[PDB]
Amino acid sequence: GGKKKVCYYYDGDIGNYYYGQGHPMKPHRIRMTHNLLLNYGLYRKMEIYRPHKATAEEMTKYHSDEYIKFLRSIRPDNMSEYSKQMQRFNVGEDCPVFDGLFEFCQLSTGGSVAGAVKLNRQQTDMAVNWAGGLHHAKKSEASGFCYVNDIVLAILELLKYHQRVLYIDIDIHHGDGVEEAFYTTDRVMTVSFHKYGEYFPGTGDLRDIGAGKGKYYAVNFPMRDGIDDESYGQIFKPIISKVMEMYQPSAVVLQCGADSLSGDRLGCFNLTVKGHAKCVEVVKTFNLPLLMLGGGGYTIRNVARCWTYETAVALDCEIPNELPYNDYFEYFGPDFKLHISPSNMTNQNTPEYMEKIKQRLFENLRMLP
Numbered sequence: 001g002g003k004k005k006v007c008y009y010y011d012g013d014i015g016n017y018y019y020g021q022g023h024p025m026k027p028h029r030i031r032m033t034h035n036l037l038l039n040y041g042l043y044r045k046m047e048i049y050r051p052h053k054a055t056a057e058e059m060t061k062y063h064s065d066e067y068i069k070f071l072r073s074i075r076p077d078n079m080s081e082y083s084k085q086m087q088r089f090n091v092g093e094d095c096p097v098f099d100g101l102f103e104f105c106q107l108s109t110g111g112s113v114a115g116a117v118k119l120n121r122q123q124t125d126m127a128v129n130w131a132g133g134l135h136h137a138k139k140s141e142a143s144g145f146c147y148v149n150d151i152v153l154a155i156l157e158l159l160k161y162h163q164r165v166l167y168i169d170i171d172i173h174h175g176d177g178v179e180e181a182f183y184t185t186d187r188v189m190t191v192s193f194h195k196y197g198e199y200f201p202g203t204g205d206l207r208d209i210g211a212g213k214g215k216y217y218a219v220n221f222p223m224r225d226g227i228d229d230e231s232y233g234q235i236f237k238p239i240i241s242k243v244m245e246m247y248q249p250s251a252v253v254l255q256c257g258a259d260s261l262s263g264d265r266l267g268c269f270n271l272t273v274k275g276h277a278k279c280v281e282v283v284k285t286f287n288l289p290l291l292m293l294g295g296g297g298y299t300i301r302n303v304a305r306c307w308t309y310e311t312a313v314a315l316d317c318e319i320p321n322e323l324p325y326n327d328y329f330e331y332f333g334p335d336f337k338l339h340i341s342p343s344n345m346t347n348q349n350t351p352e353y354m355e356k357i358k359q360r361l362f363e364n365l366r367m368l369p
């Protein structure tokens, strides 16, 4: 038990990067998150660090030299000359070229790798990088608004000191970039809960379980539209408890993508901030070194609420539902409260469905040594 030492990573420049008019990814939400939790006074309880800008050397621990060299070079002013290379690396539409793109990648990545180093040195119990969690980026390809996979890079850092690392992903989307990087090893177990069925990125079937040495070390829980706190609570603690029992990791990475929240502009789930944060509480109780990362989230007032509350959860610090004044106070109307209510959308996930999928995953976990 006991309260944990928390190190938190934030660069105030992050909020000034702009994906372009109408693009749903708003890096400003990270600044909103920071400003809200500062105004709750959570800076009194944790160490706040500014991450370094991760280097191309650091990024090619996973990504190919040619992809990182492209990301270093491409700019809005030289786009027309790179039209062939942009298609090769899936840059240009959902993953646009914008001013400062490579510096933006260096910032999100630097916080995750810095947090992993801090955990490796046993200088913190938990490290938090809300700017991170870019689980879709591939070895040589951007995808799903992500360019550089900070998670894979951070896990590679943890693996220097940890035989087994557990990755848990509560973003509404399948963590395909992370699962793919570690699909054939048993040194990382990936566990993703996600909407599945004609949904981005198209992977994460129940029956994708890993390959080779990694067979049974990939776990996927496919879900339907409208899942609520009750349905998620049916299955999250039982599955993570069984994973902990069988896999016995020595470090954990938790991707806390907030596009699984009720009312997300892009997502189709119905979780509240309390139900989302219950996952952090569950993982926290195993008392393992823990890297907590951001992810998706497109209704940015709810992103700020979610990650502020989950920072408080990490700190075992109770905070009031009445929002303190802050630089973005108008975003939180008309209620100006921290917690959110679910919508009346139908939950397509029946209780029988939840239990059945869980039972099938339990069968797979029995195949571990």
Ligand SMILES: C[S@@](=N)(=O)c1ccc(C(=O)Nc2cc(-c3ccc(F)cc3)ccc2N)cc1
Pocket: 025, 094, 108, 131, 132, 133, 134, 135, 136, 144, 145, 146, 147, 171, 173, 200, 257, 259, 266, 294, 295, 296, 297
């Ligand atoms: C058009 S779509 N329907 O195909 C569609 C819709 C939403 C996403 C999506 O949520 N992506 C995502 C991005 C990040 C991320 C975080 C931080 C950051 F700086 C850059 C990216 C993290 C996690 C997810 N999952 C991808 C595709």
Ligand SMILES: [Ca+2]
Pocket: 169, 170, 171, 172, 173, 174, 175, 192, 193, 194
């Ligand atoms: Ca997920």
Ligand SMILES: [Ca+2]
Pocket: 182, 183, 184, 185, 186, 187, 188, 189, 190, 210, 214, 217, 218
């Ligand atoms: Ca694996």
Ligand SMILES: [Zn+2]
Pocket: 171, 172, 173, 257, 259, 295, 296, 297
């Ligand atoms: Zn997502």
